[PDB]
Design an enzyme around this catalytic site. Sequence first.
Site, PDB file in Angstrom:
ATOM      1  CG  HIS A 156      -2.213  -0.741   0.980  1.00 62.19           C
ATOM      2  ND1 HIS A 156      -3.027  -0.520  -0.108  1.00 62.19           N
ATOM      3  CD2 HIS A 156      -2.809  -1.717   1.704  1.00 62.19           C
ATOM      4  CE1 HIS A 156      -4.071  -1.325  -0.045  1.00 62.19           C
ATOM      5  NE2 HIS A 156      -3.962  -2.062   1.045  1.00 62.19           N
TER       6      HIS A 156
HETATM    7 ZN   LIG Z   1      -5.230  -5.723   2.596  1.00 66.42          ZN
END
Ligand SMILES: [Zn+2]
Lengths: 168, 410, 349, 121, 183, 279, 80
Positions: free
Chosen positions: B150
């Site tokens: 992320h």
């Molecule tokens: Zn995740």
Amino acid sequence: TIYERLLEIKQMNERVTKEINTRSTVTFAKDLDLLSSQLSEMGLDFVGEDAYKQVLRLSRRLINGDLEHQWFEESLRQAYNNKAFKLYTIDKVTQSLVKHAHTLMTDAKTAEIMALFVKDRNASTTSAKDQIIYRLQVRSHMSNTENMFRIEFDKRTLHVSIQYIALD
Amino acid sequence: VYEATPFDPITVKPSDKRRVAYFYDADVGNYAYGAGHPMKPHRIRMAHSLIMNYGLYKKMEIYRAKPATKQEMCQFHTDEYIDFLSRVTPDNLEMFKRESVKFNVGDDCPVFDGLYEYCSISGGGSMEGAARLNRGKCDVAVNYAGGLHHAKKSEASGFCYLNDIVLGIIELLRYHPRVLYIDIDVHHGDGVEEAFYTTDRVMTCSFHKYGEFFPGTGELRDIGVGAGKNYAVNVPLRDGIDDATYRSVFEPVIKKIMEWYQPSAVVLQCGGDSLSGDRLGCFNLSMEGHANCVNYVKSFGIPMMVVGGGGYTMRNVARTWCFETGLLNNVVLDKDLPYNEYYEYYGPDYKLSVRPSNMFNVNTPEYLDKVMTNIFANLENTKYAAEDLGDVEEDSAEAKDTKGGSQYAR
Amino acid sequence: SQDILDLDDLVEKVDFYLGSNKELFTWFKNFVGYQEKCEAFGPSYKRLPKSDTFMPCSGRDDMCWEVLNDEWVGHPVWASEDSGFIAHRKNQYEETLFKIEEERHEYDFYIESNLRTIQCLETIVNKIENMTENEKANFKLPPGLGHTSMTIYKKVIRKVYDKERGFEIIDALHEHPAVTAPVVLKRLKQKDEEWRRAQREWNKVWRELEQKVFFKSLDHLGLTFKQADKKLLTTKQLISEISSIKVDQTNKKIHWLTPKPKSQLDFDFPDKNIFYDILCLADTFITHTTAYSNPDKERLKDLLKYFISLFFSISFEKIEESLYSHKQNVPYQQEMSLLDILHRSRYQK
Amino acid sequence: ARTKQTARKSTGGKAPRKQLATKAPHRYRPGTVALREIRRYQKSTELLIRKLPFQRLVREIAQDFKTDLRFQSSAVMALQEASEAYLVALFEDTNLAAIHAKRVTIMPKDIQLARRIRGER
Amino acid sequence: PKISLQIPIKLKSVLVDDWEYVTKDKKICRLPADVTVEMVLNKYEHEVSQELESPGSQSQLSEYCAGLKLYFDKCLGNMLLYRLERLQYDELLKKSSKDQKPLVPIRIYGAIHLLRLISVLPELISSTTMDLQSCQLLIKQTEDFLVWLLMHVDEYFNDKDPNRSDDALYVNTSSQYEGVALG
Amino acid sequence: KNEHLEKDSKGNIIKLNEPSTISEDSKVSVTGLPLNKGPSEKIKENEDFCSACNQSGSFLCCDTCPKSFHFLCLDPPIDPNNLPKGDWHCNECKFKIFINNSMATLKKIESNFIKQNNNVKIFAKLLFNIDSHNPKQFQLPNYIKETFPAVKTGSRGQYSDENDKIPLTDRQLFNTSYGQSITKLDSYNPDTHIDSNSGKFLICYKCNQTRLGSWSHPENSRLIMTCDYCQTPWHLDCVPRASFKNLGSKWKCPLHSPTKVYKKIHHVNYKVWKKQRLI
Amino acid sequence: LRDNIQGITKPAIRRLARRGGVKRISGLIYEETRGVLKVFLENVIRDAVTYTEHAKRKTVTAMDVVYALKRQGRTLYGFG
Ligand SMILES: [Zn+2]
Ligand SMILES: [Ca+2]
């Protein structure tokens, strides 16, 4: 509705019955006191019987009131992997079915409908016009507002087909 | 092109006998995010504790990757961001206020003590995993400590500070002309997709839950720009996907990619979030339906690297990561946990299973056919065709690690 | 026609209007001359200006510049349309396994982080007792005590030794370990024993609580079932459901031209022995129920057996044995027609 | 210079960040209806304070005196019919104090005086 | 009292779009624009000077152009910037000091920022204490400018997608620039 | 009833401090046992809003008057790292101080300014006045925003259009029973397949069906949503659509004319057309 | 149950005082009455609990509240 809920249990009954018996305690969790023993003392673990026949004699205890609701549900959670959640209101659906069946004896208008049905169902030879005779008489007993249904049965294939009718 | 098919038991393929390399740095368990934070780096330690007790160390080769330097971390992240990571500590948060807003650090992704060290463990762990595949030393690399997909170039999002996967892939890219990235975390892998969106040398096939679910990107129409058009592949799934339906989607798509865009290596990010019962993810995948994803990608025969990624329920992710480590070693593990230090966690039957929930599966076969049709329409365009480099130093950790994990307590 | 919209874009939009009428849409495609067989940017990503892409990276090789992406960027605050996200809802019980999980980690984090220091100091301490006292005078420990992690041994000592006071311990531990390390190891083991003695006591609390509420956490549909059934199993929705199928077959008749068929709803009954199973269930409830008066309950029992034996062709006598056996598990039969049951007056005869 | 602070450190507001800090005609003249509202109440005996908001008020008070109390559904009434009356007396006394001060509208000055003079302070 | 300024609808529709790009789309204008406030007034002062014959009005025109420049320098810092653009303004000041040349806003900012000053001119006029004959002097003169700006609206305000052209007057904002400016 | 560390470095260390271990850890005290185990056991002056933005943030506060400013808003912007030393004043207070205590009548101060610059004379007062006001955030005057009915100012000063969906009440998002979640109708709500006011079924446009399934078999049901402008129901399958989109903005159904068209010239590469705003 | 004293509404107080006899109720009462009612219950309950806590019971029954009210001087009738 009861038949759909019950049948899908009996279809799993062969797979589930084998699964419940063959599950084994881990040796490292049996020497220590770790595995839950609450249900085994109460007997609500399907270790000794086939699952489906046991689910019935648990339901028979639910209506009888012997078994608390939260204990009946929890027993089907561990036995069927949460799969059989529909059998949480088998006590109430049975009740509503009886209540609706009571309407059939009372409500003398409705009883007169199955007065005609029994005669028709007993008739082996029914002409095409005879069905129309059967339909029109039944329509006489309902109000012109109510919308009659047609439930159709096929004896050879145990197939029941319901048609929705709102004709003249 | 979506054919609903019942799930089949995971079967091991005797044709492939890959020699795995496992990357475990013993310290990575001792870092904690916060008082109630979902990301818990403990899950690596239990997932390693279970592995050692099955005796999987007899087949694998245990490694301790040298932690990533400050310079090597910068080959993806800008120098300003990495410099902020090194100094930042909970006591120093007052001194850094403009940065903590500019760099999304310390509010949802907390500034915990040891922030730099933990990130330094992740990257050297994935980067070297790519370095060993290139040399030909191992056909598989397993780095559960890393996988943080992320993070961005100058931003920390989704609990992920250092985006190791980009660091890992760039290391593979120095030998293999084409690399495939496969995401099975319930969130969209925006960190890797946004990094490789332009290039065609990497295809980022990501399965995720769309519909204003973090990060709310990865819509079906996102297929990259510039040279990397059609070289991005997002499959937006709906809620409550389960074992049998996931396989009917994962396998056909992956089989298409490895035919039309023949990758030389795969980076498979085995996300734990997709499993049932996790606190932040909403799928119904069980272990067998999740570990089957790894077994399929392995069966193709091309070098791959398995990274841990995100997993938010320690009990479930530690079990599936141990089972997936079993499949890579061509051994299907027994459904009986062995005694391990973290034994009281895996209640209540104390077996190696993640039990699928009762929630209603909503992806519909009419919908899944339209998603898989558009992807196949696109994929027919993707026809094939103190610095340390190739960090290789590995450390041979097992002599030190055998007494850990393996328990004869009673 | 204003030359604002391209022909291909026109045909694509008309598709959403005239898609179903294939004979019509094909004619329209023929008329405009549409022939079948970049700008596909995507909604998520926006381009940055050229200047902002210059913020430096120290260790980017020439290869990294071609591969990585610097111009295109996408962020949650843009994809969310600034309105935020929706997290997946969780049970009342599934949020208990999360409270337990954190209580598990909090005890496990502190204990294990403490152990890793114990082994680090234990190898150190044995070294001092090997060394000469004069030697002991000068055996400072570089940071990290020679261990791999410089940070772990600080977060553990600071916790035990009172926050701030703890800082001059570490400086004392480096500057003068020979007299500091034995003392710090002693207490850290002592704090280890207290922490473990708690976990064991806390293990029983966590294990039983997980046992009471685990199988409910998986059960998303079971918890809300009891309320949903009485909402969705009513005289209304059972008629709305069947009518919904009738309108579909006639709607398309309007558009797809589906013929009007019979039997909107179809059921199938593969297994017979469920009927004796439902009857014995409703047999139990009828006898137990207090609402229905005792003389009338005999009709409720005798309605279900006769109606079933009539509709589904099952012989009545076969049903009576099934109920009889279920009575066993726990004097004459003239022909009672279902017609007789439906009228009270004939029933008494 | 003195700078307060910012309470929260992110631009998104955590609405888009997971594990959020912030996302998990005819009219009566004035007074004429008042009197009509009095004779409609001083003639009636029904309880005025809403019940279920009172039940949750008594429980909240009981906690910091003892934990896990269970009130008989009668003993929540017997509190309400008492605390309703206490107030109605207090309001009569304040109305007297205001008629005294030569204004019509009771005010906290009147409340505090009608309590001080009672000696029930 | 209340001063009314008739802005032509097209210019009144630009601003609203400018209000949309900077607050909703969160994109700011490339600050060193091509048509800055200086040459916009340089052209207008030069096109209208030849048009009008009477020397009396030429004095009126030239000072309104000379004045509007001086006012714009003082005004831009205070009330011609949305919150998101404050940081971009700051980096220009921070660049100016290093470049050792003082920032002059009329040289940098574009024609749209001139229109922002025109929009709030009635509010600024009402606040102060001015002769009435000068109020109609500014407003009439400005209404003459806006009319001229309407005739040339095409080649100052062009609608180009920032993702595409890159010559568009507006450029998007990075997730780091937006964070500091708003946070 | 009252009446009723330092160590000689050569020597041993004095014990640092008796650990005051009252942690109030998520479990009640790390060293403490569980308490009573009742459940869980089966058996037993300055404002807080920036004067310029009117929003929150880190502020730099005027000393004389209760007016706070962001670090970016005040002109010129001030670095959070480096600040002017000592007391600070807003440009308004500096003006009053400036005027006061020197050549105090403003007139004479202003009368010098107008005489100082006679060329700009038409703008003389406006230039002088701008030195007194505090920095501000630009907001379009009301006579512009009132021209277009659709546009309206949001809570933060945002541009909010007819397209932006009206925000959900914070209660509706977070206060729902488990069985029914308002935000996502992913729990078999059959009352979606009904038109509330008229009582007829909502029919999708693509397939001209409503797929309300039996309570016995809910997988036969297909999700349906309605446009926010058209009010023409669509399946989430027919328009391929992942979810309901009830947060961000109004969902424009397919079948609604374009409001912005990018045309490639096929020979700039493209031309842009935007529908005129509603006056 | 963080704030329940805000549950005793504005029309709740207004209804009470209307029975009391007032005509116009100034705005600051609606808050200030809550301050009185609160400090009334904190005295009546703290006594009712003590009678309960003595008898070893775990339920504050009406026969307690009638007693706690009696010492207050506010004798109550109808319950015991
Ligand atoms: Zn995740
Ligand atoms: Ca790509």
